[model samples]
Target: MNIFEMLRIDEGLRLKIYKDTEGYYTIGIGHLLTKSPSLNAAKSELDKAIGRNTNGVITKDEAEKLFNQDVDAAVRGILRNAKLKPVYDSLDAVRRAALINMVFQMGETGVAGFTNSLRMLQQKRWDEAAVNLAKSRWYNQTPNRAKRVITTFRTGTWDAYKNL
Candidate 1:
């Protein structure tokens, strides 16, 4: 019935920091641990979010506000490539979201390593762009997600790997 309802359904209304399917510590609704915290760095921000022997909780409104702030920060980070912004904007929504996801996982500096991939994108060589993405270390590290983005890159459609 609303954005909040959708997020609650999709991300699950876990009032605490809990492990997701991949066993990563996530808190509130879809907030992935920014860094490893289950076993590393007691003073880490992840632990800070948990804020308990092993858990924490917040109101649904707090989670909604947190999610919005997170998305804004992510968009701001992706928009940092002034020279590439126009090209990035020109892509279909799925492709654009995929690139933003890449930036989120890899960070701006990690994304800079994909010189060939970005260049192929600008060159409008769709197949080469997909191939280039498959060749990256990030692909192997995140193969399932890579499949989704790769398919979107090749087809500009949101169907092939849409469920991913």
Candidate 2:
């Protein structure tokens, strides 16, 4: 498949800006425009494009177009740190995916705060890594997701739901 097709699948292509899970305005594959528009620029081009409400929501195609414009830079921004770079690069694809999800969810800085978990991961200690990953506010915030991701981190499979 082409690169465009692959990214759309991952980002889920939201055309119009909508309040996300974090109650921030997001558009096209997780492009977060979280802050409010300045009163001086209340009617900027962006505001004009995304009218308030779901009615303001863009189609998947429109979202894909915007995703193309925004996401590569976001992904690049997340990968630009030295602190966890070695661990991130050393992981297999599934572990990398798990780490990337945390990067996206918490920003790499947020994920780095789980230093013990990062250490376990760097050491290739899957069980300890999963346990360390669980011993965080992130796990407390989302236990079910953590369980699934932990299983994936440990086994490279989405098999935790079997336990659920």
Candidate 3:
């Protein structure tokens, strides 16, 4: 199933969708803030939202079009601007993807609150990073997701549903 399909729209979430899109008429949970309804447009807006929140950078429509070709590249651009490349580069691909997924959900600055985790990563202290990873507010807020991502990071495997 696709990501949206995996996140089934339950009644409470459906209510959130209704409230979020009160004036706008749309069938899906995802919707573009500045364009007509389309999955591509919604994903583009999500990418833009992540970009803006992470790096304080704004992306244009033209850049959004490139999302189809390279989501990682687009995400990397935002991370690079946020000066997160060093920390990101230190991770294995699966771990990096997990971290990026978390960042996508929590913004770069929000994720940056994991100062000890980042430091452990910088120092190449994998186990310590793993421990610090579970000590964040995010871990408390989203325990299942946090656990899965940390498992991916530690094991170098992508079994995390949240990474999807």
TM-score, every prediction: 0.68, 0.68, 0.54
**lDDT for residue 69 in candidate 3, whole number 0-100:** 31
Residue 111 error, candidate 2, Å: 1.6
lDDT-sorted candidate list, best first: 1, 2, 3
| Stretches of candidate 2 exceeding 4 Å from the true structure | 1-16, 35-55, 65-71, 158-164
Candidate 2 residue lDDT tens string, 1-164? 22343334434555655655556566667666545643323224345545433444567765555555554543564468776778878887666666665665566678777878888888889888887788777788667666766777888663553433
Model 2 TM: 0.68
Which 10 consecutive residues of model 3 have the lowest summed lDDT? Answer: 10-19
Q: What lDDT score belongs to each candidate, Candidate 1 first?
A: 0.64, 0.62, 0.51
lDDT of candidate model 3 versus the reference:
0.51
**lDDT tens readout by residue for model 3, 52-109:** 4322123344333333334344356546644567777776656666666555545567
Worst 10 residues of 1 by lDDT: 1-10
lDDT for position 121 in model 2: 81
Runs of candidate 3 with Cα error greater than 4 angstroms are 1-74, 161-164
